[PDB]
Structure formats: C-alpha cells, structure tokens
C-alpha cells in the first residue's frame, strides 16, 4: 500500500525535526524539570518513530 508509506514519510520528516530540536534543547542549560519535560518528548517522539517504522514495513 502506497498510502501507508506516504503517511509514514509525511510523519517521519517533521518527527526527526522534533527529535532534532529536542536533542538540541537537551544539550542546553535547563533545570531538572525542563530536562524531565524534554525526556518525555523524546520518549514520545521515539515511540512515534517506532510506530511509523512498523507502518513502513507493514506497507511492504
């Protein structure tokens, strides 16, 4: 199915950007709560990137 592949790619590109900026923020000067708030974003975004990886093989 081409839709799932298109949906995955459409989601992946912003998603790597999210992770990219999240990483950058993690390297910066932030409080533990901020860092903790960031760790949840990373976890959620990484989990989301795991799902769309399934979808992209599922289409295959």
């Amino acid at each position: 199915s081409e839709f799932l592949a298109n949906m995955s790619h459409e989601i992946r590109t912003p998603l790597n950007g999210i992770l990219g900026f999240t990483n950058l923020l993690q390297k910066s000067e932030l409080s533990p709560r901020q860092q903790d708030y960031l760790t949840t974003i990373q976890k959620s975004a990484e989990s989301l990137l795991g799902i769309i990886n399934e979808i992209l093989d599922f289409s295959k």
Partner: protein, 195 residues
Amino acid sequence: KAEFLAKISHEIRTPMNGVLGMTELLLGTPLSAKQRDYVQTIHSAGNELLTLINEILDISKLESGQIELDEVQFDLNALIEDCLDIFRVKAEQQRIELISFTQPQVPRVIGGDPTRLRQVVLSLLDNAFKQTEEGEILLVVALDDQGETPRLRIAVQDSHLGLIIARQLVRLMGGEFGIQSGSSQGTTLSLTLPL
C-alpha cells in the same frame, strides 16, 4: 480497512498530544531566546502533524460508519472568504496574486458540513501554493448544471496526502472531484457537490 487506519492514527495521536502537552508546559518555564525558538518550532511542527493525524482519524471514522457528516445551513461566501484570508498573508510572502470569483447565480447559503468543507478548500489552496511559484492562483465558485439538478462547483487553478483526504471527503459528500491540466492553463483542482 477504515478501522485499521483509525486504529493506527489513534496509536499515533496519543504520543503526539504527549509531545504537544510537554512543549506547552515548556513554553511556560524560563527559556532563553534560542531555547524558546526551538520549543516553539517543536510546538508548531507538532500541531501541524497532529492536525493531519486527526484528519486521518476523522476520515477513517467517517468511512467506518463510526461518525457521520454534518448537515447545517451555512454562509458559503463567508467560508470561502475565511479560507482566502488564511492564504492572503502567504500570497504576499510568496509573491502570488490570489484571486477569487464567485458566480452570479451561486446562492449565499447552502446545506452541508461546513468545518469539513473548509478542510477541503483549504487543502486545495494548500496544494495550489506549493505547486505555484510567483504566478496566479484562482479560486472559482460556480454552478454546474450538468447532471440534472444544479450543483455547486468549487475550483482552484494554479500556474498531496491532505488532497487525498480531501477527495475522500468530497466522495462521502456525494460529490465528484476532478483534476484539470493544460500546458498553457496550469493545473485546476475542482469539486462538484450536490445542492
């Protein structure tokens, strides 16, 4: 298959709202100008991405018989003119001449699903600018009496996953959705609906 997408888009929605919620709280805590720029960028990209996902879930629910369309009287021109104002600001960042032209015989008020029709026309406009470079984008609202009862025609010509969702909506709306293109005339996306 419609329930398979709805299940997928659901699984994808939950972590997304997790990201946005966290960014929302981050925006409320002390941040440097650069940090806030990063967080604001994560928040903008996150919302655009949640919007698409919700539109994917929305159409899947509609095709799974799980929800239905809205049928209410509603000011067509106001809707059209609300969508064009969303793209005015981008027609002058992207040196584009955005024009509109509603026909004489078109009624002001019609019945249908306003919020989802708004999604459709915005999707055709979004496509249009992304395919156009310093040209003209022409949105036309007209009537199409070909096929017994008179029918509303909304077309956007210019000089793609949201467009697929837009086409499914038009079909559930009992309409047709077509694509025109000529070397001299540019590409035209149109959607003919019942009145």
